[PDB]
Swiss-Prot record, chains A, B:
This is 3C-like proteinase nsp5. It comes from Severe acute respiratory syndrome coronavirus 2. The gene is rep. 3CL-PRO exists as monomer and homodimer. Only the homodimer shows catalytic activity. Interacts with host FBXO22; this interaction promotes the proteasomal degradation of nsp5. There is a cross-link at residues 5, 84 (Glycyl lysine isopeptide (Lys-Gly) (interchain with G-Cter in ubiquitin)). The lineage of its organism: Viruses, Riboviria, Orthornavirae, Pisuviricota, Pisoniviricetes. Residues 1-300 are cytoplasmic. Changing residue 84 to R: In strain: Beta/B.1.351. Residues 1-300 form the Peptidase C30 domain.
Length: 300, 300
C-alpha cells in the first residue's frame, strides 16, 4: 500500500533535453525528431516577429552534450521557437502534444543548461498557474504524461508570477491562462481548489486505511455545491461523479456519501489529524492518479 | 522559485529495471554489468540457503523486455539474490552502492514486472522504515541518489509492515532496521521526526518568502532539545547546526534563531497557516535537498 505524490518515469524525456544558447540567453530545448522546441524569449514588451527576422540560424547555439547541433531553419509557433537541426534525435520516443484542462496533473522534468535536475508532480491549477520549482535557468523544461509507451508533452516553462507560481504553455506555443511572455504586470487570478481531486485522494485514503473522516450522511450534489463555493472549491459536476465511480465501486462508499464527509471536513476542519499524512485536503491527485497508484499500472 | 518534493531524474535507473520470475513468484531485478539483483524471497520462516541449493540457474526466468536473459550462476549476499547472466548491460551507468543514515533521502523508482511505474521522494525514517507506495508486484524496486553522473543505489523493496510502511535493504542485502524476510511478527518502532530536516525546509521557506514563523528569539542548543524530545523530534546535534550553516549564511538567520522559532511552531502549532504549502512540519527534506533545489544543481 502507501500513497505518495508520484511522478512519471523521466527516462524517455531526459533523452530529449538539450541546451539552446543565443546572445547571452541560455535556456532548455526539447529535441524531438529534427525539431528543437524552446521558449521564444530566448531571442530577446519585445516584438518577437521583429526579433526573429534579425537573427540567423547560426545565432542559435544548440548543445546536446558535447555535441553541437547545427540549426538549418527556425520558426515561431506562438511562444515556442522551433529550431530545425540537421540531425534526427535517436532517443525520440513515441510522443504526443496535448493541452490539459485545469485539474489534470503531469510530471515536470526540470532542467538547467540542458541537464535534468529533478522530476516532480504538478497539476494545472484552476487559474492556469502551476505551483512549480523553477529557478533562473529552468526555462524550456517540460511537463508530461506517459500513456503506456507514449509521452504526452503538455507544458513548457517560461516565467514566474510575482506570488511564486509559474506560467507556461502547451508545446503548441499557447499559454495556459492569460499570461504572456513580456515583462508586464500580470496576475494569476484567485485559485479555487479542485474538488473532484480532493474526493479522489479521499478514496485513496479509504483504499489505504484512513476512514476517520466518513459518516453515514449522504448529501445531494447541489447541497454539497452550496458548501463547496463557500469554501472556494470547484462546484462538482455529475460528470465528475461519473469518473469517481470506479473508486466508489471499489470501496463501496457512494460518491454522494463521500461528498457529505468532505462537507464535514470543510465545516469542522480536521482537529489536528491527517489524511494520507497531510493536514491539508490534497487536490493535486486526479481520480486516475489514484487508480494508477492504487492498482499498479506501469509503463513500457 | 518554488519548492516541491523532487525526485532525481530516473533515466539511468530505468534502463536497469528487469523482470525476474521463478516458480510462481515474479518480482523486479536490477541488472548492472552482468549481475541481476533482486530480493531473495523470490526463490520461496523459510531457510533461504536451503531453498537456493534446490534451484538451478534454469529455474530463474529473466526478461529484459522481450529479451530473455540466461542466468549462468547465482549467489545470495544476505537478502539479495545475485544472478550472473551471459550479457553485460549496455545501459549500465556509473553507479555506487551506499547505505544511508536515518534522515537522508532518496528517489524510489517503482516497478512492476520490470516496468517503471513511477518515481517519488522518500527519506529513511528514524525507525528505518520508509513511507512508500508499493503494491503487490513492486519488490526489487530501488531507491537511489544521483551524484553529478553517478547513481548511488541505497534501497531495495522487500516487504510492508502492518501499519502501511515499508521495509527493505541496501543493495548489499542487509536490511535497514530489525526487519527480516520471513512472514513473522515485526514492528517498525516508534517514529520520531527528523529535526535538522525540519529546520532545513524552514530555511527553504525563508529562501522562498514564508517568514511568518520567525521571531527575534534565540535559544541554546540544549533548551531547544528539551523541547524537541517533548515533541518527538531528534535531539539536534552541533554537527547538524554545522550543515545548517550554509542555509543560515544565505538567509542571515542564525541556526539557533530558527531553532527558537521551531520551538514556537511546536508549542503553539500553526493556527491554520502553512509553510511551503504544508500544514505539517515537513521533515522529508535534507539541508542538501534544499540547497540543491534552491540553487539549481543539475546532473549530467
Ligand atoms: C527562464 O527564462 C529561465 O530559466 N531563464 C534562463 C535564461 C537566462 C537568460 C525564466 C524562468 C524564471 C526564472 C526563475 N523562475 C522563473 O519562472 N523566466 C524568465 O526569466 C521570465 C522571462 C522574462 C522575465 N521572466 C520572469 O520569470 C520574471 N517574471 C515576471 O517578469 N513576471 C511578471 C510577468 C512581471 C508578472 C521574473 C521577474 C524573473 C520573475 C519573461 C519573458 C517574462
Ligand atoms: C513483494 O515481494 C512483491 O512485490 N511481490 C511480487 C511477487 C509476487 C509473488 C511484496 C511487496 C509487498 C506487497 C504489497 N506491499 C509490499 O510491501 N512483498 C511481499 O510479498 C513480502 C514478502 C513476504 C510477505 N510480504 C509482505 O509484504 C507481507 N508483509 C508482512 O508479511 N509483514 C510482516 C513481516 C508480517 C509484519 C504482507 C502480508 C503481504 C503485507 C515477505 C518475504 C515478507
Amino acid at each position: 500500500s502507501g500513497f505518495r505524490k508520484m511522478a512519471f518515469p523521466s527516462g524517455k524525456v531526459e533523452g530529449c533535453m538539450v541546451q539552446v544558447t543565443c546572445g547571452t540567453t541560455t535556456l532548455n530545448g526539447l529535441w524531438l525528431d529534427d525539431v528543437v522546441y524552446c521558449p521564444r524569449h530566448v531571442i530577446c514588451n519585445p516584438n518577437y516577429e521583429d526579433l526573429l527576422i534579425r537573427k540567423s540560424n547560426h545565432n542559435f547555439l544548440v548543445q546536446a552534450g558535447n555535441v553541437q547541433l547545427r540549426v538549418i531553419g527556425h520558426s515561431m509557433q506562438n511562444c515556442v521557437l522551433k529550431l530545425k537541426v540537421d540531425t534526427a534525435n535517436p532517443k525520440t520516443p513515441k510522443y504526443k502534444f496535448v493541452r490539459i484542462q485545469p485539474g489534470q496533473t503531469f510530471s515536470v522534468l526540470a532542467c538547467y543548461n540542458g541537464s535534468p535536475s529533478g522530476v516532480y508532480q504538478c497539476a494545472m491549477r484552476p487559474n492556469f498557474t502551476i505551483k512549480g520549482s523553477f529557478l533562473n535557468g529552468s526555462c524550456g523544461s517540460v511537463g508530461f504524461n506517459i500513456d503506456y509507451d507514449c509521452v504526452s508533452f503538455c507544458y513548457m516553462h517560461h516565467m514566474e508570477l510575482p506570488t511564486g507560481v509559474h506560467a507556461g504553455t502547451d508545446l503548441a506555443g499557447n499559454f495556459y491562462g492569460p499570461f504572456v511572455d513580456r515583462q508586464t504586470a500580470q496576475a494569476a487570478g484567485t485559485d479555487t481548489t479542485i474538488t473532484v481531486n480532493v474526493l479522489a485522494w479521499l478514496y485513496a485514503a479509504v483504499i489505504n486505511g484512513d476512514r476517520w473522516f466518513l459518516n453515514r450522511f449522504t448529501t445531494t450534489l447541489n447541497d454539497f455545491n452550496l458548501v463547496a463555493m463557500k469554501y472556494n472549491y470547484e462546484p462538482l459536476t455529475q460528470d465528475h461523479v461519473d469518473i469517481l465511480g470506479p473508486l466508489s465501486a471499489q470501496t463501496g462508499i457512494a460518491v454522494l456519501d463521500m461528498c457529505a464527509s468532505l462537507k464535514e471536513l470543510l465545516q469542522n476542519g480536521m482537529n489536528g489529524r491527517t489524511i494520507l499524512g497531510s493536514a491539508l485536503l490534497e487536490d493535486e491527485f486526479t481520480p486516475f492518479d489514484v487508480v494508477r497508484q492504487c492498482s499498479g499500472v506501469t509503463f513500457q
